[PDB]
Amino acid sequence: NPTYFFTFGDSYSQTGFSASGTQPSASNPMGNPDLGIGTTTNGPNWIGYLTTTENASLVLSYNLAAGGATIDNALVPAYPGDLASQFRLFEDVYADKPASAPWSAEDAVFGVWIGINDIGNAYYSTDAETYTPKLISRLESLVEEVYKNGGRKFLFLNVPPTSRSPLFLEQGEEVVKQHAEYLSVYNENLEGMVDDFTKKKGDVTTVLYDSWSFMTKILDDPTAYGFPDATCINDDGTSCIWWNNYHPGMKYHLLQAEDMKPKLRKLGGW
Numbered sequence: 111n112p113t114y115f116f117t118f119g120d121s122y123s124q125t126g127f128s129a130s131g132t133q134p135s136a137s138n139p140m141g142n143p144d145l146g147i148g149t150t151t152n153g154p155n156w157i158g159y160l161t162t163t164e165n166a167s168l169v170l171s172y173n174l175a176a177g178g179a180t181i182d183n184a185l186v187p188a189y190p191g192d193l194a195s196q197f198r199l200f201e202d203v204y205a206d207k208p209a210s211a212p213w214s215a216e217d218a219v220f221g222v223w224i225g226i227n228d229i230g231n232a233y234y235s236t237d238a239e240t241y242t243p244k245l246i247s248r249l250e251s252l253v254e255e256v257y258k259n260g261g262r263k264f265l266f267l268n269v270p271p272t273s274r275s276p277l278f279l280e281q282g283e284e285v286v287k288q289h290a291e292y293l294s295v296y297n298e299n300l301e302g303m304v305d306d307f308t309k310k311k312g313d314v315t316t317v318l319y320d321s322w323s324f325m326t327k328i329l330d331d332p333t334a335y336g337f338p339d340a341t342c343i344n345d346d347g348t349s350c351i352w353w354n355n356y357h358p359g360m361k362y363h364l365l366q367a368e369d370m371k372p373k374l375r376k377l378g379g380w
Contacts (some may be wrong), residue, residue: 111169112136113379114213116204116256117157118196119223121198121357122270123175125157129203134170141171146360153360154348157221158283159367160380169379172211174199182248186228193224195251196352202362205259214263219377223267223321224249225300229293234285238295248297263315263377265303268297270321274329276343276355281361282298297322317373324369328362335365 114134117123126148127141134141141162149155154162161171176191183192204211228245253264272278273290304318329340330353342350347359374380 111217112170113165113377114211114218115161115171115221116200116213116218117171117173117175117221117301118193118200118224118252119175119221119267120179120227121175121177122226123155123157123173123177123221123223123347124177125149125155125173126312127171127173127175129174129199132144134169134172141166147365149360150357151353151360151363152345154363155360156270156363156367156370159364160370160374163364164367164371164380166375166380167378170211172200172204175223175270177357179224180227181224181233181245181252185245185248188227188231193222193252196249197255201255201259205256207260207292211293215260216315217378218261219263219265219379220247220253220256220261221265221267222249222253224342225269225293225296226272229289229296230271233292235357238292242292242296242299245296246303249300250303253307257314259312262313264304264307264372265317265319265377267319268300269293270325270358271329272334272356273309274326274340275357276352281342291346293322294316315376316376317372319373322368325362328365336361 126143131142146157148154161169174196178189179187180186180192182194275285308316328335332340337351343352344350347353348361353359371380
């Protein structure tokens with residue numbers, strides 16, 4: 111009895127999964143590409159770990175995350191594969207529960223990790239208090255499409271402190287601050303949405319994963335997690351928190367997935 115794990119997001123979640131590539135199976139939970147390929151971590155990312163290392167039973171990963179993704183190019187634009195387009199790919203291919211992915215409300219989990227690029231690209235040009243409700247509302251409408259399809263189990267990851275990535279640190283403490291304050295407002299409104307959605311539907315199981323606090327813990331005390339500092343970059347994915355100046359490595363993603371496991375037990379795969 112597999113858990114069908116449909117994920118949506120940006121570079122922090124991408125694996126290069128193609129809807130026309132090898133599809134997920136008990137023998138190949140990720141489908142394509144090989145576990146550990148296609149990520150920004152030098153190895154598995156949090157989805158690969160959740161699927162093959164932290165899983166308590168069979169998890170099949172259909173990972174529609176695309177690098178550079180914002181929520182909707184009508185709001186904060188970036189790349190064609192925005193979150194709205196990922197939901198469209200889901201609607202086109204998997205929403206009708208084909209024989210290849212015969213999911214049901216009882217065994218499908220829809221995981222969304224979005225906002226890094228929305229905030230990254232709009233934190234200095236928009237008013238967080240009045241603009242992030244628009245982004246969050248678009249995210250909610252996308253979620254409602256899956257709810258209409260029969261999805262009932264949802265996992266939302268709030269935005270991690272990319273304010274403290276080397277990419278943003280280099281821009282100076284003023285910029286870090288302005289980005290971080292914007293991001294905090296986004297994450298509050300995300301939390302409020304997930305709570306309202308959960309309450310309003312009444313028949314959904316949802317998890318809001320506070321990636322922000324988790325990675326902030328590590329950044330604040332890196333040596334306690336085996337990292338030499340909070341700022342070095344190493345593309346081996348394990349020597350430093352950061353695999354490149356904007357993305358954490360496989361060691362971080364594994365720590366996050368291990369932190370996420372107990373919180374995911376109620377979703378059925380963990």
